[PDB]
């Protein structure tokens, strides 16, 4: 019944600055509101209980406030380790617990260009009939990156899939891997396999190519 | 220390049934109401069910009501979530947790480690581990990795050199391919001066399908 | 039990 709405959906900030996360309830819940932290890949952890009190081992830069319908979680000296998703959860309707949709905190850092490495497919996979070509972008920021495979100067589509690691807790970078899946026949019918990366850290688009059998 | 460990996760055919258990330790289990919370693959927390301290009071969210039953045994510090008529929306990571209680002074909040439930008609299939070998794709450091392809369901855990190699390793999140199978890759940056000398083995663990595959990645002739 | 009596009201 008690709907919780969280704002903003996403917040990007530089270290040492201050984040303010909002959680509004569809009806009054008094001080019976808690904040949880989840670094993706790990389970949640309680952060604030009773809307203003810190939980075990929570550093003093975290602070909650509010009562009734409006609530805020404040982080005063943002650290890279605070890159996480934050949830609010009410207990006013104790048989009926509800969570907010979540707010993500991304840490800003100095712009870092990706380290781009291409990986030719392994002969072992080739004799299975498939060719996977892997393009790795390593330790970059910001996250926005365009990866475009080209085979013999022909742009590709429908045959690539991408996966991004979560922001690292210490250096605040991202890593991306684009995988170009191909038939054993189509692979052997072409020479130049390239991976063109567009990113803020690169002055010009950068193309990473390997020539089959060369 | 207080610990909550869930078990019973796995792939289950649509319409089928699965039974999840939560083992508690380090706190007075019988004093706490217990909840189940689930999380879709990239979505937020969604409260599922609550069982009272004594076990005679239960409540379920509307989406699972009439399909889920909940029980607890205070002599074993265990709780059970019995799911039935499972469908695609029930695919989630499932946590057991205490979420503050109803007292004026909130009771402690403990979170379990979580267990993965996949509702899918696909069969459990082990991974094909293919090398990503070091080549002229190096900078100054050299990148190598393991390509874990065509497995179902998640999780796979990748360690390097039996966990001795941790710095610089990136295991990308798994992606469901156009075949209903998962593909994952793990990479690690290493000094190029050690490629001809130090052995690099990736250790892929796929507990759902019985497979522990160890692959040695050798440098390409290049 | 006391607590159970109130918890019936909440549920």
The CA–CA distances, whole Å, from B156 to B173, B182, B213 equal 10, 10, 11
Question: Contacts of residue C11 in chain B, CB cutoff 8 Å?
Answer: 52, 57-59
How close is the nearest chain A Cα to the Cα of C8, in Å?
10
CB B117 within 8 A of CB B12: yes
- Neighbour count for residue A41 (Cβ, 10 Å): 9
- Partners of A151 in beta bridges: A154, A193
B82 touches chain A (CB under 8 A): no
C5 touches chain A (CB under 8 A): no
The CATH number given to A115-211 is 2.60.40.10
- Determine the Cα–Cα distance for residues A5 and A2; give it in Å rounded to an integer: 10
Are B44 and A119 in contact (CB < 8 Å)? no
Reading phi first (left if > 0) and then psi (alpha if -120 to 50, else beta), residue A68 is in left
Per DSSP, the three-state class of B111 is strand
Per DSSP, the three-state class of A87 is strand
- Determine the Cα–Cα distance for residues A51 and B58; give it in Å rounded to an integer: 26
CB B59 within 8 A of CB A96: yes
Residue B61 in tokens: 């969210």
User: Which residues 6+ apart lie within 8 Å of B116 measured at CB?
Assistant: B9, B92, B93, B94, B153, B154, B155
User: Which residues 6+ apart lie within 8 Å of A189 measured at CB?
Assistant: none
How is residue B125 annotated by DSSP?
A: B
Edge-to-edge, what's the strand order for the sheet holding A206-211?
A154-155, A146-151, A192-198, A206-211
Residue A138 in tokens: 């390593």
C9 touches chain A (CB under 8 A): no
Q: What is the 3-class SS of A2-58, one letter each residue?
A: CCEEEECCEEEECCCCCEEEEEEECCCCCCCEEEEEECCCCCCEEEEECCCEECCCC
**Chosen CATH of A4-107 out of 1.10.940.10, 1.25.40.10, 2.60.40.4070, 2.60.40.10:** 2.60.40.10
Question: Contacts of residue A94 in chain C, CB cutoff 8 Å?
Answer: 10
CA nearest neighbour of A100 among A33, A182, A15? A33
User: Which residues 6+ apart lie within 8 Å of B201 measured at CB?
Assistant: B160, B161, B162, B214, B215, B216, B217
- Determine the Cα–Cα distance for residues B19 and B12; give it in Å rounded to an integer: 10
- Determine the Cα–Cα distance for residues B13 and A13; give it in Å rounded to an integer: 44
- Determine the Cα–Cα distance for residues B195 and A123; give it in Å rounded to an integer: 20
What residue spans define the domains of chain A? 4-107, 115-211
Pairing of strands B115-119, B10-12: parallel
- Determine the Cα–Cα distance for residues A24 and A28; give it in Å rounded to an integer: 9
How is residue A68 annotated by DSSP?
A: T
How close is the nearest chain A Cα to the Cα of B149, in Å?
9
- Determine the Cα–Cα distance for residues A63 and A35; give it in Å rounded to an integer: 10
Question: Contacts of residue A55 in chain B, CB cutoff 8 Å?
Answer: 109
B54 touches chain C (CB under 8 A): yes
Reading phi first (left if > 0) and then psi (alpha if -120 to 50, else beta), residue B186 is in beta
Domains of chain B and any CATH numbers? 3-119 (2.60.40.10), 128-216 (2.60.40.10)
- Neighbour count for residue B121 (Cβ, 10 Å): 11
How close is the nearest chain A Cα to the Cα of B61, in Å?
8
CB A211 within 8 A of CB A151: no
How is residue A203 annotated by DSSP?
A: S
CB B192 within 8 A of CB B164: no
How close is the nearest chain B Cα to the Cα of A174, in Å?
10
- Determine the Cα–Cα distance for residues B14 and A12; give it in Å rounded to an integer: 40
CB B95 within 8 A of CB B39: yes
The count of residues in chain A is: 214
* Residue A188 backbone dihedrals phi, psi, to 5 degrees: -70, -10
The CA–CA distances, whole Å, from A88 to A37, A62, A108 equal 9, 14, 23
Closest in A32, A38, A122 to B131, CB measured: A122
Residue B206 in tokens: 């796929």
CA dihedral of B162, B166, B169, B171, whole degrees rounded to 10: 60
CA B17 to chain centre: 19
Element (H, E) at A123: helix A123-126
B2 touches chain A (CB under 8 A): no
Q: How wide is the angle at C-alpha A194 spanned by C-alphas A189 and A199, nearest 5°?
A: 160
Residue B219 in tokens: 């440098």
Chain C neighbors (3+ CB pairs < 8 Å): A, B
- Determine the Cα–Cα distance for residues B167 and B107; give it in Å rounded to an integer: 39
User: Which residues 6+ apart lie within 8 Å of A11 measured at CB?
Assistant: A19, A21, A103, A104, A105, A106
Closest in B54, B58, B59 to C1, CB measured: B54
- Partners of B184 in beta bridges: B148
What radius of gyration, in Å, describes the C-alpha atoms of chain B?
21
Q: Which residues of chain C have a Cβ shorter than 8 Å from any chain B Cβ?
A: 1, 3-4, 7-8, 10-11
Are B133 and A101 in contact (CB < 8 Å)? no
The CA–CA distances, whole Å, from A200 to A10, A113, B14 equal 20, 7, 45
Closest in A49, A101, A162 to B44, CB measured: A101
How is residue B172 annotated by DSSP?
A: P
CA B222 to chain centre: 38
How close is the nearest chain C Cα to the Cα of A137, in Å?
52
CA nearest neighbour of B204 among B126, B93, B113? B126
Whether A4-107 shares its CATH topology with A115-211 is answered yes
- Neighbour count for residue A3 (Cβ, 10 Å): 12
- Determine the Cα–Cα distance for residues B91 and B122; give it in Å rounded to an integer: 13
């Amino acid at each position: 019944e008690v709907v919780l709405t969280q704002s903003p959906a996403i917040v990007s900030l530089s270290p040492g600055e201050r984040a303010t996360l909002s959680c509004r309830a569809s009806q009054s819940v008094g001080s019976r509101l808690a904040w949880h932290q989840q670094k993706p890949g790990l389970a949640p952890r309680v952060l604030i209980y009773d809307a203003s009190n810190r939980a075990t081992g929570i550093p003093a830069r975290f602070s909650g406030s509010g009562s009734g319908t409006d609530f805020t979680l404040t982080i005063s000296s943002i650290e890279p380790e605070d890159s996480a998703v934050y949830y609010c959860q009410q207990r006013g309707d104790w048989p009926l617990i509800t969570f907010g949709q979540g707010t993500r905190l991304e840490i800003k850092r100095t712009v870092a260009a990706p380290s781009v490495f291409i990986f030719p497919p392994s002969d072992e996979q080739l004799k299975s009939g498939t060719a996977s070509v892997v393009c790795l972008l390593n330790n970059f920021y910001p996250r926005e990156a365009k990866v475009q495979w080209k085979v013999d100067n022909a742009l590709q589509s429908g045959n690539s899939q991408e996966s991004v690691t979560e922001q690292d807790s210490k250096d605040s970078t991202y890593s991306l891997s684009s995988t170009l899946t191909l038939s054993k026949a189509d692979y052997e019918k072409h020479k130049v396999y390239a991976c063109e990366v567009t990113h803020q850290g690169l002055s010009s688009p950068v193309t990473k190519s390997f020539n089959r059998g060369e | 220390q207080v610990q909550l460990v869930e078990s019973g996760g796995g792939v289950v055919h649509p319409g089928g049934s699965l039974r999840l258990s939560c083992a508690a330790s380090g706190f007075t289990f019988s004093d706490f109401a217990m909840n189940w919370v689930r999380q879709a693959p990239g979505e937020g927390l969604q409260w599922v069910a609550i069982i009272s301290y004594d076990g005679r009071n239960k409540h379920f969210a509307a989406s699972v009501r009439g399909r889920f039953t909940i029980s607890r045994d205070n002599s074993k510090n265990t709780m059970f979530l019995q799911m039935s008529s499972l469908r695609a929306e029930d695919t989630a990571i499932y946590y057991c947790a205490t979420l503050g209680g109803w007292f004026e002074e909130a009771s402690p909040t403990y979170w379990g480690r979580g267990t993965l439930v996949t509702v899918s008609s696909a069969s459990t299939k082990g991974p094909s581990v293919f090398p990503l070998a070091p080549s002229s794709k190096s900078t100054s450091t050299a990148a190598l990795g393991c390509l874990v392809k065509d497995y179902f369901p998640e999780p796979v855990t990748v360690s390097w050199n039996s966990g001795a190699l941790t710095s610089g390793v990136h295991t990308f999140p798994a992606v469901l391919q156009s075949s209903g199978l998962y593909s994952l890759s793990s990479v690690v940056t290493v000094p190029s001066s050690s490629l001809g000398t130090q052995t690099y083995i990736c250790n892929v663990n796929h507990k759902p399908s019985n497979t522990k595959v160890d692959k040695k990645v050798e440098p390409k002739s290049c | 039990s006391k607590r159970s009596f109130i918890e019936d009201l909440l549920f």
